[PDB]
Symmetry: D2
Subunit: 124 residues, 4 copies
């Protein structure tokens, strides 16, 4: 099972735990791992986003072509990449940088769980 | 990663897909797999519940001592078993027998996601 | 505004607060108030359900023809009555008898909020 | 009932419907109505935010001192104003400008529903 795994990374402590889990899943299933980081609607925003994505590439060890910067609402970006890469599993945190502890699950995780093309592994 | 995996099984088509995923995860991580099925508050209810649990034991191949019938609100039962068995991953469906398609995620999955002691793998 | 108001009543302390709010809204808007209580799939279940509905009729003062017992998943029952009675506002508790405090909003309120034909007033 | 009503306004079509409902509720209950619009973390952001708040003041007719610009995560801002103004009812849309139709309820409405000091009237 699981030939392609997609990690959604936002640089939060939950996403660093999710990156560890995704690296472990890819090794255990012999899968190809893709990491993605979305930025929302300049040079400054892209520099910041590239650095966050660099961190995800460093924690997972994936090749450059498998670490993607995407633009837009995070969940939409994650879902489009997942359909494009034919992901069999999406790994993401239950919460992220914007956590206040008032939602039961972060809004981008909620959206992905509702529309995902495959199983989603939520990491606390 | 993942030494103990807990599958929450309600006999729905989502939970049969979740049982396949949990069997595959346990084999890939060399983990011990526990399957649980909760029944809500007689002889008839227990007979029905034992049969549903038998199906989960047949699809996963776990030993008898690792297939548990529990009582109460499903999510509470799942969470207590998970803390008791020191589960490192809970696998459950996004929806179950009571699905109407109006919730974004079933209520028992919502409760587990909010209170789980470990990552939760949601299977559609 | 609001000519017909529907109260969804389950006999919980939240629903008793919601009944007070619904009585106050109906008086303030000069509206017709309907109270509904759903029971899930005998003589015993119906006796219990009629008594809960009697309590809602006593707290709101509505006429008998405007206090309805319905069957099925609560939210489905509430929504069908609301479309049937052309309700302009549904008043219900944020939580109910089955509250464990783990959901952000009870599952029947979640379903109604997602599919309602009109505004929904959530009472804590 | 309801002596102080707080409308959370984001300039979306749902919030314009919510403003109509809030104006009608304030008139029916003889209540004081407060409208609030939050902006997230310059001159440009404040100009845009003041114009959105002007629209809410125009649709509800409230006095200047009762139309407030607030800063921060919207739900936090709404909740703090509600405790400060001792609001007895918060009226807000089920969805807003960022709606994609994938959440069951928008994230700021979710947060307010979970932490509100009073009933919340959700307007579709
Ligand atoms: N820009 C982004 N790029 C990639 N993944 C993202 C992302 N934003 C969020 N995620 C993923 O979603 C997970 C859950 O975070 P989410 O953004 O849903 O909640 P949050 O705690 O930040 C509150 P909010 O719903 O207001 O954003 C993160 O751990 C991460 O895996
Ligand atoms: N009695 C039970 N025992 C074990 N697991 C259960 C269970 N009930 C539900 N689950 C687990 O929860 C998953 C999601 O189903 P859930 O019960 O949350 O939603 P549902 O679609 O049945 C609507 P509802 O929230 O009304 O019950 C199921 O696939 C199963 O893994
Ligand atoms: N059988 C029923 N008949 C009428 N209204 C009901 C109902 N069950 C619930 N409701 C309405 O829904 C409100 C919220 O309760 P809800 O049932 O959604 O959550 P809960 O706290 O009971 C946990 P659960 O989702 O497991 O049932 C109740 O206050 C009541 O207004
Ligand atoms: N900046 C803001 N100021 C005041 N009220 C706001 C607000 N943002 C949202 N709201 C209120 O919340 C309601 C629901 O919108 P919400 O922002 O929760 O969902 P949304 O559809 O914009 C998706 P998202 O959760 O990504 O923002 C809006 O109709 C409005 O009443
Ligand atoms: Mg976030
Ligand atoms: Mg169920
Ligand atoms: Mg209930
Ligand atoms: Mg239920
Ligand atoms: Mg919004
Ligand atoms: Mg957001």
């Amino acid at each position: 099972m699981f030939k392609t795994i997609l990690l959604a990374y936002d640089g939060s402590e939950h996403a660093r735990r999710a990156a560890e889990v995704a690296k472990a899943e890819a090794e255990a299933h012999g899968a190809r791992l893709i990491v993605v980081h979305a930025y929302e609607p300049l040079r400054r925003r892209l520099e910041r986003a590239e650095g966050v994505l660099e961190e995800a590439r460093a924690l997972t060890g994936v090749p450059k072509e498998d670490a993607l910067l995407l633009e837009g609402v995070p969940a939409e970006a994650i879902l489009q990449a997942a359909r494009a890469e034919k992901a069999d599993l999406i790994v993401m945190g239950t919460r992220g940088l914007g956590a206040l502890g008032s939602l039961f699950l972060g809004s981008q995780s909620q959206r992905v769980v509702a529309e995902a093309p495959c199983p989603v592994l939520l990491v606390r």
